């Protein structure tokens, strides 16, 4: 089972294809995941010059297989279950009173490591508004994921809201519409309702010149109690 | 004696749920001819669930189980699975694999006594 791939550390690498209101961009990402604890961290790099959109709208674009699941849970765990020949992630976010992001992810083991490849295409954002006009704060909160089964495509429906703060004080909403399925045939876990308890915590290395984003996350799942 | 036979996969789940249990042959394994889950609730005998042919994969399914249940097996790895769908409370059980290697008439795997080694058994619970 796809579990015992994630008993230790494991390398991550992450690509990003980007379209935002004709704006295109390419990041990528590298680091590590350890499941066992449900720790991320990773650094990114827009490969193409200055990114044209504030990097926390990306964080949760840019590996759901590293939360932590506790040992009464882990029948729940269906990121794992689907390695390491992978899942297609889709995602459309609605970012309110503002445009919206469209994407399609592969993640799946070539080896040893993780790879995370994505297309995204945004439309519809004011040129004035919080996203092409830089306006959210560098920083992330806390986020409960919803997670429930879809037995017709043998996969999982996934929801969540994510509060990202503005610098006049104020909060931009971006509302999370979420489908994983698996690449592969063999058998995967479909799992009860429940949820990914999600922090973030992103900062700058000093070292760094291109524009970039060093991201921690832990993940662990709850909402079962047994 | 000359096969071994591990059975994984029972844990507690709901009505209505899916769960799948296997079983790992090793030792002797060459000689297989058909292996078979048996389940043993509470207070009741060993019944039969379903047996798979070695050579062909035919399957036999028992009556209570028939439409929900399915049996498979990978003769390159030594392993029979069983797929259970639409699980209910009555499914609730110890999921016991076996094994044959004497040839047989299809008629005689439905028995306890048909078979030539047994596994420890894995719990199934049903809420």
């Known amino acids: 089972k796809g579990e015992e791939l994630f008993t230790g550390v494991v390398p991550i690498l992450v690509e990003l294809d980007g379209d935002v209101n004709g704006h295109k961009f390419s990041v990528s990402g590298e680091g590590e995941g350890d499941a066992t604890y449900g720790k991320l961290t990773l650094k990114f790099i827009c490969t193409t010059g200055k990114l044209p959109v504030p990097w926390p709208t990306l964080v949760t674009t840019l590996v759901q297989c590293f939360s932590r699941y506790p040992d009464h849970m882990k029948q729940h765990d269906f990121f794992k279950s689907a390695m390491p020949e992978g899942y297609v992630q889709e995602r459309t976010i609605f970012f309110k009173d503002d445009g919206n992001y469209k994407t399609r992810a592969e993640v799946k083991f070539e080896g040893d490591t993780l790879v995370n490849r994505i297309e995204l295409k945004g439309i519809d954002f004011k040129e004035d508004g919080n996203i092409l006009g830089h306006k959210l704060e560098y920083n992330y909160n806390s986020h409960n994921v919803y997670i429930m089964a879809d037995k017709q495509k043998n996969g999982i429906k996934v929801n969540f809201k994510i509060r990202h703060n503005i610098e006049d004080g104020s909060v931009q909403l971006a509302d999370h519409y979420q489908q994983n399925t698996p690449i592969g045939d063999g058998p995967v876990l479909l799992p009860d309702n429940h949820y990914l308890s999600t922090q973030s915590a992103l900062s700058k290395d000093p070292n760094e010149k291109r524009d970039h984003m060093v991201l921690l996350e832990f993940v662990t799942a709850a909402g079962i109690t047994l | 004696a000359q096969v071994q036979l591990v059975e994984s996969g029972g844990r507690l789940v709901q009505a209505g749920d899916s769960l799948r249990l296997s079983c790992a042959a090793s030792?002797?394994?060459?000689?297989?001819?058909?292996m078979a889950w048996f389940r043993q609730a509470p207070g009741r005998e060993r019944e039969f669930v379903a047996a798979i042919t070695w050579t062909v994969g035919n399957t036999i399914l028992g009556d209570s189980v028939k439409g929900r249940f399915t049996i498979s097996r990978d003769r390159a790895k030594n392993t029979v699975d069983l797929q259970m769908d639409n699980l209910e409370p009555e499914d609730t059980a110890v999921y016991y694999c076996?094994?044959?290697?004497?040839?047989?008439?299809?008629?005689?795997?439905?028995?306890?006594?048909?078979?030539?080694?047994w596994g420890q058994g894995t719990q199934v619970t049903v809420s």
């Open positions: 076996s094994a044959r290697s004497r040839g047989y008439v299809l008629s005689v795997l439905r028995s306890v006594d048909s078979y030539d080694y």
């Open positions: 030792g002797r394994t060459f000689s297989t001819s058909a």
